[PDB]
Ligand SMILES: O=S(=O)(Nc1cc(-c2cccs2)nn1-c1ccc(F)cc1)c1cc(C(F)(F)F)cc(C(F)(F)F)c1
């Protein structure tokens with residue numbers, strides 16, 4: 001039944017709603033200017049950032065990290081903290097994908113480890129326009145120009161993500177489309193070191209049918225959107241390998257210590 | 272609500288299975304016989320010690336270096352390496368505790384820094400009986416009468432752990448009980464130097480309620496088990512102060528030591 005596929009789409013939207021407080025629909029209204037209530041703080045330069053360490057921290061001192069050290073470094077570390085948070089959220093959502101928790105425990109672990117980054121860049125696009133990105137739970141907005149202005153290695157971090165987002169966003173996907181897409185990415189039977197490939201493909205098969213039916217009904221006038229969407233999955237992998245290269249350059253060339261243990265042993269045979 | 276609290280237990284039990292390779296179940300299987308494999312190498316004197324270390328012949332080099340010392344200090348070296356490795360495991364599991372990674376970064380660090388040792392000994396009981404302890408992934412045993420025999424300082428190290436374990440093990444906790452208990456340990460709002468106490472206590476509260484239900488549902492005949500388990504937190508805090516106490520006496524009677532930088536930080540300014 002098509003009814004079951006819609007039931008599955010529906011189940012995935014609701015779990016997505018619970019796992020991810022800042023949804024695309026909310027982020028876009030923020031990025032535009034709907035129901036004017038509490039406009040976000042704008043970080044457009046080194047000075048406004050300084051002025052802003054005490055606009056997302058000073059209220060009560062519970063930050064992503066302390067002061068001092070280069071601004072490029074501080075932003076880097078703040079994004080470390082932020083990604084481990086994104087990961088817990090993605091992990092929670094994953095357990096709500098039917099069949100996922102019943103997979104071999106270590107295949108769960110492998111799936112998450114290779115899948116999380118592609119889900120971050122997909123979902124970070126919902127938070128982006130062509131001019132910058134919502135941060136601090138939609139409380140701030142950091143310009144693409146400022147990120148790009150940071151000294152050499154760190155100024156190149158974000159541009160590729162911005163470039164992906166602009167084009168991905170032109171697809172006009174809504175959270176109900178993204179909910180199933182994110183689930184398709186998780187369940188990829190081609191990740192390195194997976195034990196049982198077939199049960200993962202059997203799940204991704206059902207989520208592919210659901211994704212297809214979703215897009216046909218929700219986006220009838222977008223000829224071959226399903227296909228276009230699956231092709232973006234190769235774009236995502238590129239953004240990831242490229243982000244992984246740059247992290248390897250940073251860690252080999254820089255002089256700043258003590259980092260987030262999460263993706264530290266996860267630096268072992270990645271993308 | 273009961274179902275939230277049941278899901279919390281279930282969640283915590285999964286990450287537990289994911290972060291910790293030698294669980295309590297599997298370990299008692301090795302101590303009992305219930306397992307369909309091997310039989311651990313018993314170390315009781317200097318000769319069977321000089322047997323157990325060299326026994327590494329079909330079980331080659333473990334994550335650690337070459338045993339470039341003597342007897343006591345030779346174990347002193349390996350257990351340091353085991354500790355480092357348990358910490359990694361405990362850090363990984365902590366990140367999976369809902370709300371942990373959203374806390375102030377410095378309080379995450381402080382919570383780990385104190386909580387780690389308590390969880391070490393708690394989980395060390397799982398691998399213990401009154402006669403000795405599984406070491407090396409449970410491929411070895413190592414009598415309490417051997418460990419007790421050692422030199423003036425090294426002679427009071429595992430004893431307090433064994434005595435703790437004997438009584439803790441009479442509580443009949445499983446892996447699913449222990450999953451919640453260890454989370455309640457890390458989320459302790461009284462650790463010195465904590466910056467925002469209340470959000471930590473908030474989470475412990477929820478964990479405490481989940482512990483309660485787990486015990487009540489899992490051990491319905493065990494009178495006041497909740498209270499008796501939590502009383503065990505005082506015992507654990509004593510083992511830690513004793514441990515860290517020999518670790519000082521060691522700096523007066525022995526020569527050069529030096530620790531993995533992860534253990535140096537973890538023992539830094541520790542009561
Ligand atoms: O995947 S990211 O590009 N990671 C990242 C960016 C940056 C920097 C940008 C500018 C100067 S340093 N650092 N990191 C990062 C992330 C994780 C690490 F382990 C190490 C570094 C990322 C960027 C951002 C943001 F766009 F807001 F910059 C946000 C996140 C979030 F919220 F998902 F955590 C992630």
Ligand SMILES: O=S(=O)(Nc1cc(-c2cccs2)nn1-c1ccc(F)cc1)c1cc(C(F)(F)F)cc(C(F)(F)F)c1
Pocket residue numbers: 343346347348350351352353354355357391392395404405406418425428429432530534
């Ligand atoms: O926490 S322990 O008591 N550590 C420890 C024991 C011992 C020794 C006992 C007898 C001679 S040396 N040394 N250490 C130790 C551990 C870490 C340090 F930084 C310094 C010392 C410990 C003992 C054991 C065991 F019983 F196996 F000995 C195992 C572990 C494990 F698995 F948690 F790492 C930890």
